[PDB]
C-alpha cells in the first residue's frame, strides 16, 4: 500500500504556527517510502488527539494498513501505518 496523503491534525496549531485540520501530502516516490501517524492521550476512555500527519520511512510502520498502538499503557499513544488516510482510525491493542 502506497501513502500519498494523510489526515493532518495539530492540537498545538496556535503555538506551532500551523493549520489545525486538513490533508497532508506525503511527498513520496519509488525510492521514498512514506507513512501516516496518529498520536493521542487516553484519559480513562476519553481520547484527545495530539497530532496526525505524514511520517518518514520507518521499519515500525512497514506493511501495516491499520494504525495500532501495541505498547503497554503509554503516557502518549502513537501508531503509524501505510495507505492514504490510514491514520484516521486508530486503536490500542497492548
Amino acid at each position, epitope marked *: 500500500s502506497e501513502t500519498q496523503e494523510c489526515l493532518f491534525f495539530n492540537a498545538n496549531w496556535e503555538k*506551532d504556527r500551523t493549520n489545525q485540520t486538513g490533508v497532508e501530502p506525503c511527498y513520496g516516490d519509488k525510492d521514498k517510502r512514506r507513512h501516516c501517524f496518529a*498520536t493521542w492521550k487516553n484519559i480513562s476512555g476519553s481520547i484527545e488527539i495530539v497530532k496526525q500527519g505524514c511520517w518518514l520511512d*520507518d521499519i515500525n510502520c512497514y506493511d501495516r494498513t491499520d494504525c495500532v498502538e501495541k505498547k503497554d499503557s503509554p503516557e502518549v499513544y502513537f501508531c503509524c501505518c501505510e495507505g492514504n488516510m490510514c491514520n484516521e482510525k486508530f486503536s490500542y491493542f497492548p
Partner: antibody
Amino acid sequence: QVQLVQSGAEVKKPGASVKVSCKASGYTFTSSYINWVRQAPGQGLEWMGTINPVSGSTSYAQKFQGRVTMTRDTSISTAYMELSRLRSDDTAVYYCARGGWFDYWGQGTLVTVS
Amino acid sequence: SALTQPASVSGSPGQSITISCTGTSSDVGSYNYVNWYQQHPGKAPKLMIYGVSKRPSGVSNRFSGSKSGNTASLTISGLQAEDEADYYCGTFAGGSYYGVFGGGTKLTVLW
C-alpha cells in the same frame, strides 16, 4: 535542503551537566525521530538514544540510562540532549541525526570534560 | 548486541573491496536494517547505504550493500582516493529498535 544545526562547543567540569541543542530545517520536524550519537576523540560512533518528537517518547542506550534526558520543542523544531554527572571520558563530539536511518547528521557539538 | 567490523582494510585505486559487519541471528540475521556510514576525519558521518542494500540519492553507485547469514557487507568498486575514510555499520534506531554501531573500519587507498 535538509539541515540539522547544532549548538556550539562546551567545556565542563566533572559532576556538571551539558545540554546540546539540534535545530531542524528543510523538512517537517514532527515527521520523524531524532537520534543522538556520540564519538570520543579517535574512537567509534556510539548510539545514545532516540526521541519521538510527536509523542515525546524516548529510548536510551543502557550506558546512559539515568544520566541522559532527551526533550524537544516542536514550536522551534529543536531537540535537546542533556547529559548529567559528567566525567572526563564523556569528552566527545555529540551528533543529532534524522530518523531511524540517520539519513542526515548535524555538524556535531564538542563537549570537553576537563 | 555488538556488531563486529575489521579494524582496517587497504586497497589499490580502481579495485573492488568489501567491509563486513557481523552480528547474530537475532539481529543482522533477522532484519534488513543494517546501514553504512562514511566518515572523513573531522567531519560528520554520511549515510551511504540503508536497509542492507538501498542507496540514497546523491550517493555514488560504486557503493553497494548485501547480507548473507549474520554478516552484512559494504562493497566499494572503482576505489578512489576520496574513498579513504572510516566506515561504520549500524542498525535502525526508533520505536521498538535500539541502535548499535559497529566499531568502524579504517579504509586505506595504497599508492
